[model samples]
Target: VTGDTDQPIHIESDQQSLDMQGNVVTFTGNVIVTQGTIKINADKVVVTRPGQGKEVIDGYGKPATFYQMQDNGKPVEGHASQMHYELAKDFVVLTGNAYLQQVDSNIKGDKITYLVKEQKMQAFSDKGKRVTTVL
Candidate 1:
C-alpha cells in the first residue's frame, strides 16, 4: 500500500454487488478501499468506470473518511459525509462537515478538495460560514 497509481487496489466490505450492464459496482456496510498510500472508509461506496477512462469512486456514511501519506512522509487524514475520488487526476473531494489534517496543519469547511500529485488543498464554505485553517 505504499506504491504508485500502478499499485494494486484492495477493497473489503460486508456486501458487494456489481451491475455489469451499467458498469457500476456497489459496496455496502462498512466498506473500505486501499490504494497505495491512500485509504478510504465509509458505510457505503459506489464506483463507476466506463471504458479506459478514469474511474469515479463515491463514498457515503455518517462520515466517510480518507487517509494518505504524502511523498514527504507526512500523513493526511480527512472525514466528511460524502467523499469522491477521481482517478485520472488523482484527486479527492470531501463535502459536508469536511475536514483535513496533516502534521501541524488542519482545515475545516463545508467542502475540501485535495490534489494528490501536488499535495495541495482547497477548502470552501457556504454563505453562512467561512473556511478555517490552522497551519
Candidate 2:
C-alpha cells in the first residue's frame, strides 16, 4: 500500500507521486496537494497514523501556505511562514509571522488553528490575543 501508484484518489502528479496514506507521508520534489478550493505546496510532509484511517499530516518548509480563489477569479492567500496540520482534528495552525489575506482584508497573528470538520478556524497570538483572518 506504500508503493508509488497514481490512483484515482490522486487527481494528478509531478516530479514524484503524491503520497496519501495513514502513515509516513512524504511530499518531496515539488509536491502539490490540491482538492477543490484548497491548494498546498510544500518541500516536505510528515505523516503519522495512529490507527486505521486516522492520520495527522504536517507539511514543513521554509514556509507553508494555504490558498484559495474567489468566485470572481481573485485569490485568497494565507502565509503561515511555518505551520503544522493535524489531520485527525482537521486542524491547521501557523507558527510564526502568520498572515492571511482576502482581496483587501488582512490580519497577522502568532498562530492560527482551523477546525476543519466544522469549517471553523481561529488565530491567536503567543499572549492569547484572538485574530480573525481570511484564508
Candidate 3:
C-alpha cells in the first residue's frame, strides 16, 4: 500500500485535457489509473492539485473499480458509482452502492472509506438502509 504511493501515477484514457489555470487534469472514456500495486478503472477521472503538494483524484462510472495489493499479499477490491482518492490522506472514499471485498470477507454499503496504508475500512449506510458484511 505504502509502496504504491512511492511509485509514479500512470493514467490512460481515450481522451485527456489539462486546465492549467485550475491545475486540473481530466480523463474521459475508459480511464485507467495505476500506481504500483494499486489500480483504478472508471469511465472518467479528474485529478486536481489545489496546492500544498496535495492532490485529489475523482472517478465516475457506471461502477468505478479499485484494486490494491496489501503487504500480506492479499488483494483488496471494490466498486462504486463514484470514487474519491486523497493523496495526502492516503484514503479512498467510495460512494453509491459501494461494495468492498478482501479474501473471504466482503462488505456492502451506501458509502465506504478505505485507508490504504492502514488497511482499515469504515462503511456507512443511507437512511433506512443497513450496511451488510460477510466474514
Please list the Cα RMSD from the true structure of every candidate, rounded to 1 decimal place: 2.3, 7.0, 2.1
Measured with C-alpha atoms, the lDDT of residue 8 in candidate 1 is 63
- What would the TM-scores of all predictions be? 0.86, 0.57, 0.87
Tens-digit lDDT track of model 1 for 49-131: 77623777899978789888877889889999999988778788999999888888877889899887777888898775764
Query: 15, model 2: CA deviation in Å?
Result: 7.6
For each candidate, the alpha-carbon lDDT, in order, equals: 0.83, 0.56, 0.86
Write one digit per residue (lDDT tens) for candidate 3, span 28-117. 999999978979999999988785237788999888998888888889999999999887898889999998888876777899998877
Better of 1 and 3 by TM-score: 3
Model 2's C-alpha root-mean-square deviation from the true structure amounts to 7.0
The order by descending TM-score is 3, 1, 2
lDDT of 2 by residue, 1-135 (tens): 111111122322344433345445455655566545556666765545564235554655566776654455655567666656564455667677776665675567877665445545566778667555355
Report the C-alpha displacement of residue 122, candidate 3, in angstroms: 1.6
* Pick by lDDT: 2 or 3, better one: 3
**lDDT (C-alpha) at residue 36 in model 2:** 53
**What TM-score, to 2 decimals, does candidate 3 have?**
0.87
Q: Tell me the lDDT of model 3 at 119.
A: 73
Screening candidate 3 with a backbone cut-off below 3 angstroms (N, C-alpha, C), the clashing residue pairs are none
